[PDB]
Paper text:
The bacterial member [name] is part of the phage shock protein (psp) response that maintains structural integrity of membranes under stress conditions such as temperature and infection. The main effector of the Psp system is [name], a 25 kDa protein consisting of six α-helices connected by short loops and an elongated hairpin, where the N-terminal helix α0 of the protein remains unfolded in the absence of membranes. Interestingly, [name] is related to eukaryotic and archaeal endosomal sorting complexes required for transport ([name])-III proteins and has a similar structure. Here, we show that rods of bacterial [name]-III protein [name] internalize and thin membrane tubules by overcoming the required bending energy through progressive membrane binding of the N-terminal helix in the [name] assembly.
Residue numbers in the entry:
A (entry chain J): 77 to 125
B (entry chain I): 22 to 174
C (entry chain H): 126 to 217
D (entry chain p), E (entry chain G): 175 to 217
Write the structure that this text describes.
Amino acid sequence: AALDRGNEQLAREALGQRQSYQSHTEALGKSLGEQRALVEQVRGQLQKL
Amino acid sequence: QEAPEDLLERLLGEMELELIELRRALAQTIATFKSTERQRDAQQLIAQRWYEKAQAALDRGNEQLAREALGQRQSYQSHTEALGKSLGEQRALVEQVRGQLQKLERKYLELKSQKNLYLARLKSAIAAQKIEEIAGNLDNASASSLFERIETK
Amino acid sequence: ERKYLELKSQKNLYLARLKSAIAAQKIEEIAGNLDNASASSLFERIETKILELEAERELLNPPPSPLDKKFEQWEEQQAVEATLAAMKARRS
Amino acid sequence: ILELEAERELLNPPPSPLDKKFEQWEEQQAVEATLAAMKARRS
Amino acid sequence: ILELEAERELLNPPPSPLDKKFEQWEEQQAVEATLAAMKARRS
């Protein structure tokens, strides 16, 4: 709708708005991955005990 | 310096009260920043009123009073300029302060996200440091394990 | 009085900035940046210490030798293949 | 009383000034759209 | 207050002035890329 109504200037503003979240998604897009492989290692230790 | 894990838990506790203390202080500037801003308008308002009367000062053939009226406002004219720039300086400063605060909260939560993820690993080793000591492995027969001490006695 | 109020107007505006730095002086010290790995950050001290205990288990009672895994992995193939080998004949 | 006003405006920030445009700029489409079909629907 | 500002800027140095270019110079590609496909995607 930003560009559909001949308001592409707003679309650029809209497009730049999301980039803030794009970095945030990537920022937290990898923190989860690191935790995932770590806990499963912790799980293995507990079962043996 | 207590145990590294013990200090961390306490350290984060005092961090929470820190931000909210900073939370209150920043709000004070916003209130005062507005209060002075409003104060300026009222001060500018009253001074503007005097100029309005200047029409009647000269309308009734009393221009001598108009000069007195005109000189009266000049006192407020300087005052308006005096406070006309103090607000401008404060405006650009607080917004910089605002930027700093947001990162701390965003930073603060992410640090805490991994706080417990290490505590469990820490307690994995401590439990994974005792069982062997109690019994050990029969291949070596250390005899330091309390279990062996039972056998020898 | 005119001077007094204006001075006070800026009193708090500096206190918030002052408390910005003190809070902006601790977070890095607690954790720092992973690129440098200062190890002065309390967070790193946790990482190094946990490693030390890992050595005790791996050293006081050594884990199975790397060969030991082969002797058990190389033979499990015989076990799994043996059971299915008889399974095919047993099925027939 | 002003101090508390900041907490609401800061602790949970209000919608951005742009956000009002994204909703005000589109409500015109909604109101105009319904009446646009209304005229044709009437006919 | 200035003295503490140095610690953050020095103990953990901020991104290099170049680093801003590497991220600013590429964001233009990102923003232009999405709208470039948007025009074709719209058509």
